[PDB]
């Protein structure tokens, strides 16, 4: 089974270095390219270079003007990337990727990597519950969420139930505020007949200012209808 | 240099419709490769060496093409295939199409819509939050607009949408609307006013402070 495990994503100052990692299993590390591809919203996808492990050769797209440097531990099955003399051009989430096994296609692509270039600090998201909601006066069906509010830089993950609930889940794109910070919702419907006795928790987790939350998401106490 | 022209930019089609999306080259090229992509994950290999389909890749997909212009095939659309569709060639530069945009196009829905008034833990930090959900609604124009008692509320509000849902092919928005928690204590009614071609008149969300 051929992975591609790239590091976490990365706040970095303006004029700072970054070095990113794609380790590698699967295959024999030697006889594969390791390319490394750039992606910014609204942009496409640009092709930044390519390094093969134990050669000493790579190749470099020359927009990068010799700031993307490419290394390759063989003995370890891992593949660096690092990109100098950093701004907001660099902010971008960035690929490695591995060729076919016969073909030259990108086969195999890792998770990704968010960098972001500011010379803003990092701030936590404050966690708070969106308590259940009906959908009608009938009752029947509830929607449910967490906000996730005021952090910076880019991404949060939300899951619920530790990834056991996935079906009517909404996580929204993040809002970036005047303020410069962000903040997005996760939502999910489910059944009315559900709210007594099913929990329902979101998991948070920005990485960047090591902020890592459970938040319970109960109904609330006291409504102004009877009863459905 | 070789430039790939993708074409169109963006479409959009019914379920079990026969779909070409096209890749056209300033000068010939010998092959093409595809690659989906879906928002907030990686892109995937789809087809390769122009007609070769990735392992998993519906039948429905197919790919062709020849010198200046390559093509990729879809015999009958299905709410899965909500993706953005790059073609790549490496004696390109760009190597990389800037990618067509491909959404289904599914009958009128009537957005679901839900109002939360602010958590008590956010109230005491200083601040009121009161989101608004539009849920699972087609087409993507809405209108969301807050009335906080008797008026209209302007640029206090963020709106997000989602991506096209991969299994029904409706989209869903929040708009939350932010107010400092003196703000918040002014006022007593907090509405969302809905508007949707799925509406027959517009919806409205409210409670009390």
């Known amino acids: 089974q051929v992975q591609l495990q790239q590091s976490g994503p990365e706040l970095m100052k303006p004029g700072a270095s970054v070095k990113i990692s794609c380790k590698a299993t699967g295959y024999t590390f030697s006889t594969s390219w390791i390319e490394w591809i750039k992606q910014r919203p609204g942009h496409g996808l640009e092709w930044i270079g390519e390094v093969l492990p134990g050669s000493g050769k790579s190749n470099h797209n020359a927009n990068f003007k010799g700031r993307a440097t490419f290394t390759a531990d063989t003995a370890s099955n891992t593949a660096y990337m690092q990109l100098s003399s950093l701004t907001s051009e660099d902010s971008a989430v960035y690929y490695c990727a591995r060729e076919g096994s016969n073909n030259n296609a990108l086969a195999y692509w890792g998770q990704g990597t968010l960098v972001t270039v500011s010379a803003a600090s990092t701030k936590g998201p404050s966690v708070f519950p969106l308590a259940p909601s009906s959908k009608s006066t009938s009752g029947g069906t509830a929607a449910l969420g967490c906000l996730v509010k005021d952090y910076f830089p880019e991404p949060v993950t939300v899951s619920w139930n530790s990834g056991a609930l996935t079906s009517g889940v909404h996580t929204f794109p993040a809002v970036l505020q005047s303020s410069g910070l962000y903040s997005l919702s996760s939502v999910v419907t489910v059944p009315s007949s559900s709210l007594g006795t099913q929990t329902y928790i979101c998991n948070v987790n920005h990485k960047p200012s090591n902020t890592k939350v459970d938040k319970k998401v109960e109904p609330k106490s006291c409504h102004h209808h009877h009863h459905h | 240099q070789i430039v790939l022209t993708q074409s169109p930019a963006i479409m959009s089609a019914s379920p079990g419709e026969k779909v070409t999306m096209t890749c056209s080259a300033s000068?010939?090229?010998?092959?093409m490769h595809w690659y989906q992509q879906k928002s907030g994950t990686s892109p995937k290999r789809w087809i390769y060496?122009?007609?070769r389909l990735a392992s998993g890749v519906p039948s429905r997909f197919s790919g062709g093409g020849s010198g200046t212009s390559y093509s990729l095939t879809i015999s009958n659309m299905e709410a899965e295939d909500a993706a953005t569709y790059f073609c790549?060639?490496?004696?390109?530069?760009?190597?990389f199409g800037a990618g067509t945009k491909l959404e289904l196009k599914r009958t009128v829905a009537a957005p679901s819509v839900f109002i939360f008034p602010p958590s008590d833990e956010q109230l005491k930090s200083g601040t009121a939050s009161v989101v608004c959900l539009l849920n699972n609604f087609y087409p993507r124009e809405a209108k969301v607009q807050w009335k906080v008692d008797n008026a209209l509320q302007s640029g206090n509000s963020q709106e997000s949408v989602t991506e096209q849902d991969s299994k029904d092919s409706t989209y869903s928005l929040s708009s939350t609307l932010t107010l400092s928690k003196a703000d918040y204590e002014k006022h007593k009614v907090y509405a969302c006013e809905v508007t949707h071609q799925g509406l027959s008149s517009p919806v409205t969300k409210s409670f009390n402070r």
């Open positions: 000068s010939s090229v010998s092959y």
């Open positions: 060496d122009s007609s």
């Open positions: 790549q060639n490496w004696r390109s530069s760009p190597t």
